[PDB]
Amino acid sequence: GANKTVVVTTILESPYVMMKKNHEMLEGNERYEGYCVDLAAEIAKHCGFKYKLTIVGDGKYGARDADTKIWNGMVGELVYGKADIAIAPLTITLVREEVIDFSKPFMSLGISIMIKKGTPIESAEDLSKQTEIAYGTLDSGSTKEFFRRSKIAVFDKMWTYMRSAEPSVFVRTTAEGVARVRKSKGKYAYLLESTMNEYIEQRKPCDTMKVGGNLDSKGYGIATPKGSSLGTPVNLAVLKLSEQGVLDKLKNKWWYDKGECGA
Amino acid sequence: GANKTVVVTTILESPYVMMKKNHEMLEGNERYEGYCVDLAAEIAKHCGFKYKLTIVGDGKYGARDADTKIWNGMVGELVYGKADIAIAPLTITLVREEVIDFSKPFMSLGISIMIKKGTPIESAEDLSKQTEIAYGTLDSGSTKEFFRRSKIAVFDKMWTYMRSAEPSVFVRTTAEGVARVRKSKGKYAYLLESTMNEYIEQRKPCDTMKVGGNLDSKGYGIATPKGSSLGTPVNLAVLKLSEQGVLDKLKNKWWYDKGECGA
Ligand SMILES: NC(=O)c1c(NC(=O)Cn2cc(CO)c(C(F)(F)F)n2)sc2c1CCCC2
Ligand SMILES: N[C@@H](CCC(=O)O)C(=O)O
Ligand SMILES: N[C@@H](CCC(=O)O)C(=O)O
Ligand SMILES: [Li+]
Ligand SMILES: [Li+]
């Protein structure tokens, strides 16, 4: 039928989507800012749709419960028909690809290590061979699943430690992991995507650092319910935006034009 | 109907597909080796098909003629029904995505600069601001199209020079560009994908180098004719291989276990 206003699910994750400081003064899409707010506007312009930004109710990316088989997060909003499209730093994974459609990637990333400056850790192997510095991941996301599923010795060692560590090493939001790095005096390291790590490294108080090579190599895609008619035009818009350099412009806008820690 | 032997189109490009030194002694798929030969075997195993490797007749990646609208290269073999799948370092681009299907990417890359060691060039901006050192790209590929289409000032300057330079700066194969870098005493620089650049930098005679940041950020996908029933299983196999670390293993096998230029 006729075109309808598209419900966009997204997540508060800096610098992809952030509440504007003065958001209580504002209405609708204007409340938010960030890389994915700008991306949404570009994809909607190129595909010719009107849209409403909504923040995922449960604050999660999307995982399936092993007992109930119910999807949560942004993936769940798509699967159950609550949103029409997810425009967020949503990692392309096998499990997710089987239940939703993804565009080609709009940004690349890998899992990485964040430390408080001066922590004596340079690698995942170093984490795995000691115990004084605790380490963990986000819940309900792809980084947790990476460790849980890994058959690679160093990552399996790390998961075996993380799943049983007390107190819990897992966090509900990225911001919580960063806060824990910052407040734990070098005794917590956080495993998170390179894109988020690199953003935070250039924010005040400039007390974190990315160390080591990335652990994997993957990407974020725009997600639609399986078989949706938005899938094909959204995919072509991501490739056009990539080829026009708009994705690179946006990355510079929100990472390194935002840098507060000098050159 | 019943499963049939799958015709794979690919291209001789090191270290993705190479003739084994003793290939005249060998038959069929056994003649070839490389990252994409190993990838083909893995994708065929995971998808349950038998296959035949074939080298693209015309030795091209795939471009459309602006007059005739005919596709050449591996893209053409897919479009015209001569091959069932392309398993090669085939860049995901808008123009191509409109006519064939691509898996999610199996490797990431960007356009990059190769120099003979000691050449006084550190960047694309440096190339663009001088004339003593000639520079060019491969024909019938995505790097040429990147420059031809760019509205970015430095890249448009470079294309304006390249399209009219005499003698021609363009090459028919990667190997030809490398040979030209090596033989031109620092007076030719070659624009090529980072993956190929980094491979060649670790091969004897160890006289080339990658300089500068990548110019773009993209990926290679496995390609199938539009609407083919191999598309979905091939895409899931690429994601499973990525998540199992097989893609990373293969990259180390063919890049850095193959390195001849020391540590
Ligand atoms: N900008 C990108 O990240 C990008 C790419 N990024 C990647 O290829 C990174 N990446 C690697 C993998 C393998 O795991 C993935 C995947 F598979 F997760 F999709 N993304 S491919 C590509 C683009 C832009 C549009 C053209 C094609
Ligand atoms: N991008 C991740 C969330 C962050 C993480 O797991 O580190 C996902 O899509 O699940
Ligand atoms: N990967 C390229 C060929 C190499 C290049 O253009 O530098 C293509 O798919 O056209
Ligand atoms: Li999917
Ligand atoms: Li396509």
Swiss-Prot record, chains A, B:
Q: Where is this site: Interaction with the cone snail toxin Con-ikot-ikot?
A: 64, 148, 240
Output the Gene Ontology terms for molecular function: AMPA glutamate receptor activity; amyloid-beta binding; cytoskeletal protein binding; extracellular ligand-gated monoatomic ion channel activity; extracellularly glutamate-gated ion channel activity; glutamate receptor binding; glutamate-gated calcium ion channel activity; glutamate-gated receptor activity
Listed under GO biological process in this entry are: cellular response to amine stimulus; cellular response to brain-derived neurotrophic factor stimulus; cellular response to glycine; cerebral cortex development; chemical synaptic transmission; conditioned place preference; establishment of protein localization; ionotropic glutamate receptor signaling pathway
Q: How does the record comment on the protein's domains?
A: The M4 transmembrane segment mediates tetramerization and is required for cell surface expression.
Gene coding for it: Gria2
> What more does the entry say?
The postsynaptic actions of L-glutamate are mediated by a variety of receptors that are named according to their selective agonists. This receptor binds AMPA (quisqualate) > L-glutamate > kainate.
Subunit field text: Homotetramer or heterotetramer of pore-forming glutamate receptor subunits. Tetramers may be formed by the dimerization of dimers. May interact with MPP4. Forms a ternary complex with GRIP1 and CSPG4. Interacts with ATAD1 in an ATP-dependent manner. ATAD1-catalyzed ATP hydrolysis disrupts binding to ATAD1 and to GRIP1 and leads to AMPAR complex disassembly. Interacts with GRIP2. Interacts with GRIP1. Interacts with NSF via its C-terminus. Interacts with CACNG2, PICK1 and GRIP2. Interacts with GRIA1 and SYNDIG1. Part of a complex containing GRIA2, NSF and NAPA and/or NAPB.
Q: Where is this site: Crucial to convey clamshell closure to channel opening?
A: 121
Q: Which residues carry this modification: Phosphoserine?
A: 150, 184
- Annotated residues for binding of L-glutamate: 89, 91, 96, 142-143, 193
Give the record's GO CC terms: AMPA glutamate receptor complex; asymmetric synapse; axon; cell surface; dendrite; dendrite cytoplasm; dendrite membrane; dendritic shaft
Induction, per UniProt: Down-regulated in the pyramidal cell layer of CA1 in the hippocampus by global ischemia.
Q: What is its main location?
A: membrane
Glycosylation is annotated at 3
Q: Which cysteines are joined by disulfide bonds?
A: 206-261
Superkingdom in the source lineage: Eukaryota
Presence of the UniProt keyword Cell membrane in the record = yes
Annotated organism of origin: Rattus norvegicus
The residue ranges for the Extracellular side of the membrane come to 120-263
Tissue distribution is: Detected in forebrain. Detected in dendrites of neuronal cells. Expressed in the pyramidal cell layers of CA1 and CA3 and in the granule cell layer of the dentate gyrus.
**Record protein name field:** Glutamate receptor 2
Q: How is it modified after translation?
A: Palmitoylated. Depalmitoylated upon L-glutamate stimulation. Ubiquitinated by RNF167, leading to its degradation.
